[PDB]
From Swiss-Prot:
Coiled coil: none annotated. This is Guanine nucleotide-binding protein G(i) subunit alpha-1. It comes from Rattus norvegicus (Rat). Mg(2+) binds at S16, T150. Residues 165-174 are annotated as: G3 motif. The gene is Gnai1. Pfam families: G-alpha.
Amino acid sequence: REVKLLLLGAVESGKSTIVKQMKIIHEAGYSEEECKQYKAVVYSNTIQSIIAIIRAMGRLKIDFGDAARADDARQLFVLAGAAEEGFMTAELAGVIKRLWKDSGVQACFNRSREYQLNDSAAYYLNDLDRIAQPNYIPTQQDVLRTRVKTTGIVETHFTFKDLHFKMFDVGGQRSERKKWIHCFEGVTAIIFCVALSDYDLVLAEDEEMNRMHESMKLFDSICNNKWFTDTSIILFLNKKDLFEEKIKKSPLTICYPEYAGSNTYEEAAAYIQCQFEDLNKRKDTKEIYTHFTCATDTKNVQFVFDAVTDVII
Ligand SMILES: Nc1nc2c(ncn2[C@@H]2O[C@H](COP(=O)(O)OP(=O)(O)OP(O)(O)=S)[C@@H](O)[C@H]2O)c(=O)[nH]1
Ligand SMILES: [Mg+2]
């Protein structure tokens, strides 16, 4: 009756967002106290995002659309400290707001594949007025959108379909992957997450190795690990919503030079699915249960997880 699910995957593939979904779906979601706890993370993610674009503008040599933004940018650092403490003055919000609307800033934002930027940058920045209002309390989506690198082993429990689930989540960054082996015992099923949107990105840890190629190496390792022969391997080709948006303006050939299909979601998605499933060295004896997901979308995850559970039995 107990089921141990181990979430694996490279950095920022969406493993922890899936864990938060289990809370939203199988419990009653984040309470007011828990949401308030996330208020400091939302604000630091937001400042972190705008500072990242402003930093990038310096390296890439992009000017502000209006010279006036220069002192707004300086006023940003003077007031940024407040943010991580969980406070957002109308003045700071005003400063971020004006910065986010600048064409030079927007020009740099659109070049975000050239540097590291929070996936939820536009989500928070576009909702500045809401998140900055007095007595703001994060909504479940706000919590789902927060980014905090995972270190250590986070364990979560929930009951679904009469089964007692014990879900384990670990971090995907270099230092943390070395510690995955500590969770290899008694795993009922592994949900390996992959950010489909990584195809045109370099690692936060390196820039000559394509993030998806790294994801492929990790999957090749796990999937084929004989220790995992009787463990169901579920593959979540995640961030399908960002992939759909990217495929229209960024060639999949960057990652896979041999790709002949068109820049359409359906064709490119199927191609990546095949790339990963092809790594399975025992296709007739081992089945990989693939699902396309958008971790932040509760409904998608709810139906996908219901499906995965039926597979687990
Ligand atoms: N738009 C969008 N954002 C997503 C999706 N899945 C995850 N995210 C966002 O991506 C960021 C990273 O997600 P997270 O769950 O922290 O990744 P992780 O794999 O758990 O990363 P780590 O813990 O190894 S470093 C978070 O801000 C989360 O809200 C998705 O499908 N769509
Ligand atoms: Mg995590």
